Design an enzyme around this catalytic site. Structure first.
Site, short mmCIF file in Angstrom:
data_model
loop_
_atom_site.label_atom_id
_atom_site.label_comp_id
_atom_site.label_asym_id
_atom_site.label_seq_id
_atom_site.Cartn_x
_atom_site.Cartn_y
_atom_site.Cartn_z
N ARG A 1 12.86 -2.48 10.43
CA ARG A 1 11.90 -1.96 11.40
C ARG A 1 11.73 -3.00 12.53
NH1 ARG A 1 6.52 0.60 8.22
NH2 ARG A 1 5.46 -0.75 9.76
N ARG B 1 0.44 -8.73 13.77
CA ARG B 1 -0.17 -7.72 12.89
C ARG B 1 -1.06 -8.40 11.82
NH1 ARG B 1 3.41 -3.71 9.56
NH2 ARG B 1 5.20 -5.00 10.21
N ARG C 1 11.75 -6.42 4.31
CA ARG C 1 11.59 -4.96 4.17
C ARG C 1 12.74 -4.20 4.83
NH1 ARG C 1 6.39 -1.49 5.92
NH2 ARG C 1 6.66 -2.75 7.84
N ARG D 1 -9.10 0.98 9.66
CA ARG D 1 -8.79 -0.42 9.97
C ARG D 1 -9.96 -1.13 10.65
NH1 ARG D 1 -3.57 -2.34 10.25
NH2 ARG D 1 -4.83 -4.26 10.49
N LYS E 1 0.84 -1.22 0.00
CA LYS E 1 0.00 0.00 0.00
C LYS E 1 0.86 1.25 0.00
CE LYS E 1 -2.13 -1.12 3.84
NZ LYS E 1 -1.35 -2.35 4.22
#
Ligand code: AP5
Ligand code: ZN
Ligand code: ZN
Ligand code: ZN
Ligand code: ZN
Length: 203
Positions: free
Chosen positions: A150, A161, A124, A85, A13
């Site tokens: 991260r 998540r 990532r 969300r 996204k």
């Protein structure tokens, strides 16, 4: 124009929104990005959000809704990315817009399997200098560019998540299907193929 990007953690996204931002002038609103920066700065907002983000839990709706009220761009085309969300958040967004005589034009659901989620997030990498997002395999940082992973891209946090996403998005999907503005895209494809589906849906 008002767009909402919905999709699992790692769906891409941010990658798509950041391209529309630089190529078509959209204003990119990523609640995750904004919260992360608050946490990093240690503002009252960051202190309040830290506990949830650390554990891969949703920040409570009341804090997010107030946040969106504050960060809503007054001008320009907007992409809401990782917001709403929950149905409560979506209702708040629909009301905010209605007061302005605006609405959500399109909801793009970025569909990928869990396997791909894990692959995307674990690989990532971020340039901490600029927040540019890379992927060790699919879009590596160029030679010489230092990157970090991260803390919330660690395996235990990704899994939480993803769980919270699969549970909370179901009613939200239904909510927007009811309005007839939801479009599914196969976000498992290469970045370029995903971008093309995006442009097709919104053009
Ligand atoms: N509204 C809200 N309510 C409550 N809590 C909220 C909230 N908003 C935020 N929060 C809190 O904040 C936390 C973080 O939120 P948030 O930051 O919104 O997390 P998220 O939506 O779950 O997912 P990501 O930001 O990790 O994924 P993305 O879809 O943008 O993918 P990206 O472009 O980075 O891409 C991922 C990787 O894949 C690569 N990639 C992208 N596309 C492709 C492709 N097509 N092919 C191959 N690789 C690709 C990229 O280079 C990258 O490495 C939440 O857990 C929650 O605690
Ligand atoms: Zn993101
Ligand atoms: Zn009203
Ligand atoms: Zn659960
Ligand atoms: Zn349109």
């Amino acid at each position: 124009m008002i767009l909402v990007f919905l999709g699992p953690p790692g769906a891409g996204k941010g990658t798509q929104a950041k391209r529309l931002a630089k190529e078509k002038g959209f204003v990119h609103i990523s609640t995750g990005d904004i919260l992360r920066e608050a946490v990093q700065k240690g503002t009252p907002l960051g202190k309040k959000a830290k506990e949830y983000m650390e554990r891969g839990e949703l920040v409570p709706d009341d804090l997010i809704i107030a946040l969106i009220e504050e960060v809503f761009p007054k001008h320009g085309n907007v992409i809401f990315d990782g917001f709403p969300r929950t149905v409560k958040q979506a209702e708040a967004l629909d009301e905010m817009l209605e007061k302005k005589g605006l609405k959500v034009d399109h909801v793009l659901l970025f569909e990928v399997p869990d396997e791909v989620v894990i692959e995307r997030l674990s690989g990532r990498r971020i340039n901490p200098e600029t927040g540019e997002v890379y992927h060790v395999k699919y879009n590596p940082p160029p030679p010489g560019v230092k990157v970090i992973q991260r803390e919330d891209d660690k395996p235990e946090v990704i899994k939480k998540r993803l769980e919270v996403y699969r549970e909370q998005t179901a009613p939200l999907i239904e909510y927007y299907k009811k309005k007839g503005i939801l479009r599914i895209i196969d976000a498992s494809k290469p970045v370029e193929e995903v971008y093309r589906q995006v442009l097709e849906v919104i053009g």
